[PDB]
Design a protein around this motif. Structure first.
Motif, PDB file in Angstrom:
ATOM      1  N   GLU A  45      24.316   3.254  76.440  1.00 17.72           N
ATOM      2  CA  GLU A  45      25.187   1.954  76.517  1.00 17.72           C
ATOM      3  C   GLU A  45      26.219   2.119  75.646  1.00 17.72           C
ATOM      4  N   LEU A  46      26.271   3.088  74.584  1.00 18.03           N
ATOM      5  CA  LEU A  46      27.477   3.222  73.498  1.00 18.03           C
ATOM      6  C   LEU A  46      28.203   4.331  74.211  1.00 18.03           C
ATOM      7  N   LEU A  47      27.488   5.333  74.823  1.00 17.60           N
ATOM      8  CA  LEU A  47      28.470   6.188  75.488  1.00 17.60           C
ATOM      9  C   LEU A  47      29.176   5.848  76.846  1.00 17.60           C
ATOM     10  N   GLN A  48      28.735   4.870  77.360  1.00 19.06           N
ATOM     11  CA  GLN A  48      29.556   4.123  78.355  1.00 19.06           C
ATOM     12  C   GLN A  48      30.352   3.091  78.328  1.00 19.06           C
ATOM     13  N   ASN A  49      29.905   1.951  77.747  1.00 21.22           N
ATOM     14  CA  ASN A  49      30.577   0.895  77.080  1.00 21.22           C
ATOM     15  C   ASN A  49      31.179   1.040  75.663  1.00 21.22           C
ATOM     16  N   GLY A  50      31.077   2.081  74.944  1.00 19.06           N
ATOM     17  CA  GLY A  50      31.839   2.385  73.711  1.00 19.06           C
ATOM     18  C   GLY A  50      31.266   1.341  72.728  1.00 19.06           C
ATOM     19  N   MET A  51      31.777   1.371  71.569  1.00 23.53           N
ATOM     20  CA  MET A  51      31.196   0.709  70.486  1.00 23.53           C
ATOM     21  C   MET A  51      32.000  -0.413  70.477  1.00 23.53           C
ATOM     22  N   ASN A  52      33.101  -0.720  70.985  1.00 24.08           N
ATOM     23  CA  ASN A  52      33.928  -2.052  70.964  1.00 24.08           C
ATOM     24  C   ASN A  52      34.417  -2.326  69.750  1.00 24.08           C
ATOM     25  N   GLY A  53      34.853  -1.454  68.762  1.00 21.94           N
ATOM     26  CA  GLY A  53      35.302  -1.755  67.577  1.00 21.94           C
ATOM     27  C   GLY A  53      34.362  -1.850  66.365  1.00 21.94           C
ATOM     28  N   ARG A  54      33.023  -2.322  66.661  1.00 27.40           N
ATOM     29  CA  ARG A  54      32.091  -2.534  65.744  1.00 27.40           C
ATOM     30  C   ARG A  54      32.085  -1.121  64.949  1.00 27.40           C
ATOM     31  N   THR A  55      31.152  -1.058  64.032  1.00 26.77           N
ATOM     32  CA  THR A  55      31.169   0.227  63.157  1.00 26.77           C
ATOM     33  C   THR A  55      29.563   0.127  62.734  1.00 26.77           C
ATOM     34  N   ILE A  56      28.829   1.432  62.935  1.00 27.64           N
ATOM     35  CA  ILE A  56      27.557   1.721  62.797  1.00 27.64           C
ATOM     36  C   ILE A  56      27.351   2.733  61.585  1.00 27.64           C
ATOM     37  N   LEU A  57      26.743   2.016  60.538  1.00 23.08           N
ATOM     38  CA  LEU A  57      26.522   2.747  59.240  1.00 23.08           C
ATOM     39  C   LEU A  57      28.100   2.861  58.471  1.00 23.08           C
ATOM     40  N   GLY A  58      28.894   2.096  58.892  1.00 20.86           N
ATOM     41  CA  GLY A  58      30.240   2.214  58.576  1.00 20.86           C
ATOM     42  C   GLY A  58      31.085   3.246  59.115  1.00 20.86           C
ATOM     43  N   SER A  59      30.836   3.786  60.261  1.00 19.97           N
ATOM     44  CA  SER A  59      31.474   4.770  60.917  1.00 19.97           C
ATOM     45  C   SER A  59      31.926   4.258  62.350  1.00 19.97           C
ATOM     46  N   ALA A  60      33.228   4.430  62.700  1.00 17.38           N
ATOM     47  CA  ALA A  60      33.612   4.185  64.107  1.00 17.38           C
ATOM     48  C   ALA A  60      33.348   5.219  65.076  1.00 17.38           C
ATOM     49  N   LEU A  61      32.604   6.185  64.883  1.00 21.22           N
ATOM     50  CA  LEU A  61      32.167   7.219  65.844  1.00 21.22           C
ATOM     51  C   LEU A  61      30.675   7.481  65.716  1.00 21.22           C
ATOM     52  N   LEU A  62      30.164   8.071  66.697  1.00 24.76           N
ATOM     53  CA  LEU A  62      28.820   8.420  66.731  1.00 24.76           C
ATOM     54  C   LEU A  62      28.617   9.774  66.094  1.00 24.76           C
ATOM     55  N   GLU A  63      27.766   9.853  65.086  1.00 24.67           N
ATOM     56  CA  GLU A  63      27.741  10.996  63.809  1.00 24.67           C
ATOM     57  C   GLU A  63      26.470  11.963  64.528  1.00 24.67           C
ATOM     58  N   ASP A  64      26.806  13.129  64.304  1.00 23.20           N
ATOM     59  CA  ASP A  64      25.694  14.146  65.129  1.00 23.20           C
ATOM     60  C   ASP A  64      25.560  15.166  63.901  1.00 23.20           C
ATOM     61  N   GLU A  65      25.795  15.095  62.796  1.00 20.93           N
ATOM     62  CA  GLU A  65      25.537  15.900  61.476  1.00 20.93           C
ATOM     63  C   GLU A  65      24.566  15.609  60.794  1.00 20.93           C
ATOM     64  N   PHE A  66      23.356  14.795  61.382  1.00 23.80           N
ATOM     65  CA  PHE A  66      22.345  14.436  60.423  1.00 23.80           C
ATOM     66  C   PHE A  66      21.039  14.737  61.298  1.00 23.80           C
ATOM     67  N   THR A  67      20.336  15.403  60.745  1.00 28.31           N
ATOM     68  CA  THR A  67      19.031  15.936  61.578  1.00 28.31           C
ATOM     69  C   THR A  67      17.960  14.917  61.224  1.00 28.31           C
ATOM     70  N   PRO A  68      17.009  14.754  62.032  1.00 27.37           N
ATOM     71  CA  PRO A  68      15.954  13.669  61.676  1.00 27.37           C
ATOM     72  C   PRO A  68      15.091  14.220  60.682  1.00 27.37           C
ATOM     73  N   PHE A  69      14.965  15.290  60.063  1.00 26.81           N
ATOM     74  CA  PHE A  69      14.372  15.747  58.791  1.00 26.81           C
ATOM     75  C   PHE A  69      15.354  15.491  57.893  1.00 26.81           C
TER      76      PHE A  69
END
Ligand SMILES: *C(=O)[C@H](C[C@@H]1CCNC1=O)NC(=O)[C@H](CC(C)C)NC(=O)OC[C@@H]1C[C@H]1c1cccc(Cl)c1
Ligand SMILES: *C(=O)[C@H](C[C@@H]1CCNC1=O)NC(=O)[C@H](CC(C)C)NC(=O)OC[C@@H]1C[C@H]1c1cccc(Cl)c1
Lengths: 293, 293
Positions: free
Chosen positions: A263-287
């Motif tokens: 849903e985010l990749l298609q409809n975007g964040m729409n300004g809201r912020t996740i964890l205080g970030s306006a982009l989708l972060e990919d430098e945190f591993t599950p571990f």
């Protein structure tokens, strides 16, 4: 968040050859550093490291730890240069050399003139580059993890690329990716987003009260069909099983989180912020997220 | 990027009182830690720390360094508790206690059970909170700077607020802001954006090849008229003079950078990203960007 750097601080030394000065890693009785320290301004364009190192002797290497160590043996392993020294580092931690895979993260201790200046966390991008913050003299700085009381060294910095990202080697001298230690333009493959890391990030968000992005569902083949369009790494079942513990701790089926991500990749964040970030972060591993539960 | 944490790692100890366990800072012959360690589950709602500490003795405090130190003297300074111990820390660095101002940054060494787990950089928000990442047991973790070889301790963590931000004291026990160490709902003032930090950030961007946001001009009174609407701290002349060196190094008049910023605040970024961020970052001070030139 990056690993505590004390164990690695006690291993950084200043290495000098001619006028070039960069950082070295003093473990046991060996100092590891990039081999292009033996280069001059002219050599850097297309050096013949064999012929260049041949013209060098032990007394041409001035290692300065805080003290001036004496070299008594030198060899070249791939793109790294190994100095045998008379003294063995008393601050040597329990260590091992490991070659990490793309998508894995690690902490970098940025050093200049052999002195630690800062520490930050990076990821090994799918194209085998890293989005770091390196200046001149930073060469020789290492990336590392800390498991138990054992420092797993995985990276040594060498160069910057025309696009501003960074390239380097493991601690055996083998470059990550398609790079060579000469001062020429080198391109990196098209980067991709580490999908499993973004999911772990969304989990860390849910754990921290961020839930506006939760929703539908989808199948593994379906989401991956959506992800391949946005240059997102395809999500395998191993990725699902890696995110298992986060699913158990939070109670969100992995594939339901995937649907929220689609849903985010298609409809975007729409300004809201996740964890205080306006982009989708990919430098945190599950571990990583598990270590900060 | 955060300061190297080795000097601070050697000062973290585990402190225990009853069942409560948090972290302490062992400097010279004194262990500093939050005073609410002497609290039980019932005491935390509205403790009378005088009467509570009165019912405690030295042998009720179990300090465990890596070793089990013995306490021989205890007092309460404001909201921090000071243990005199028999041994003096041999890893004691050159240190000083300083109370930082809002807008200044510092590195936090996050610890649990007396063991360092991670390090990251924070800012003292204008409302005297910090947007950190603290879990249970993290209390006692300290924030610090490193000038020359001197560790300036400026923060000790105490609690989380209803909004998820964090509050704590200096190393004398005085809270930053309007907070008290009891388990009650406490509100923080409306936050503001550290304008001078955002400018230093835009400078760091220009230094790193990001220039799509450069443009017009404006007067100090004019920009501040625009900034007061977006909850941006008013930019004084001292702020200008602080950004002087960055202006000299880059060749952009401070007020011209301000005009570019006013354009962002009004017309938004429009999707583009500065320094790989979709928001305007305000936790980098000019002195910070100078340390990473
Ligand atoms: C060592 O400290 C230094 C670190 C670099 C300096 C600038 N930012 C860094 O991270 N590394 C080197 O100087 C390295 C040595 C060679 C033997 C590999 N060379 C380097 O980093 O310069 C690379 C410049 C970008 C490449 C380039 C070449 C042709 C065209 C273009 Cl557009 C760029
Ligand atoms: C010590 O490790 C711990 C750190 C906290 C734990 C959770 N995340 C942290 O940073 N600090 C405390 O437990 C502290 C002790 C008191 C004597 C101050 N109390 C605390 O942090 O709990 C605060 C909760 C948010 C406040 C609250 C009160 C009423 C209503 C609401 Cl909505 C929230």
């Amino acid at each position: 968040m990056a690993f505590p750097s004390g164990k690695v601080e006690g291993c950084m030394v200043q290495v000098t050859c001619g006028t070039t000065t960069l950082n070295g890693l003093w473990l046991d009785d060996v100092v590891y550093c990039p081999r292009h320290v033996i280069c001059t301004s002219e050599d850097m364009l297309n050096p013949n490291y064999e012929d260049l190192l041949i013209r060098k002797s032990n007394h041409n290497f001035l290692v300065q730890a805080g003290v001036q160590l004496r070299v008594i043996g030198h060899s070249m392993q791939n793109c790294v240069l190994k100095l045998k020294v008379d003294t063995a580092n008393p601050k040597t931690p329990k260590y091992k050399f490991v070659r990490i895979q793309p998508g894995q993260t690690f902490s970098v201790l940025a050093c200049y003139n052999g002195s630690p200046s800062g520490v930050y966390q990076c990821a090994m991008r799918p194209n085998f580059t890293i989005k770091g913050s390196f200046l001149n003299g930073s060469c020789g700085s290492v990336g590392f993890n800390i498991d138990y009381d054992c420092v797993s060294f995985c990276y040594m910095h060498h160069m910057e690329l025309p696009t501003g990202v960074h390239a380097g080697t493991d601690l055996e001298g083998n470059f990550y990716g398609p790079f060579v230690d000469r001062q020429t333009a080198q391109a990196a493959g098209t980067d991709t987003t580490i999908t499993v890391n973004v999911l772990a990030w969304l989990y860390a968000a849910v754990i921290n009260g961020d839930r506006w992005f939760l929703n539908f569902t989808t199948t593994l083949n379906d989401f991956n069909l959506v992800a391949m369009k946005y240059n997102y790494e395809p999500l395998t079942q191993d990725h699902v099983d890696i995110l298992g513990p986060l699913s158990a701790q939070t109670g969100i089926a992995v594939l339901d989180m995937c649907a929220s991500l689609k849903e985010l990749l298609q409809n975007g964040m729409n300004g809201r912020t996740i964890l205080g970030s306006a982009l989708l972060e990919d430098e945190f591993t599950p571990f990583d997220v598990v270590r900060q539960c």
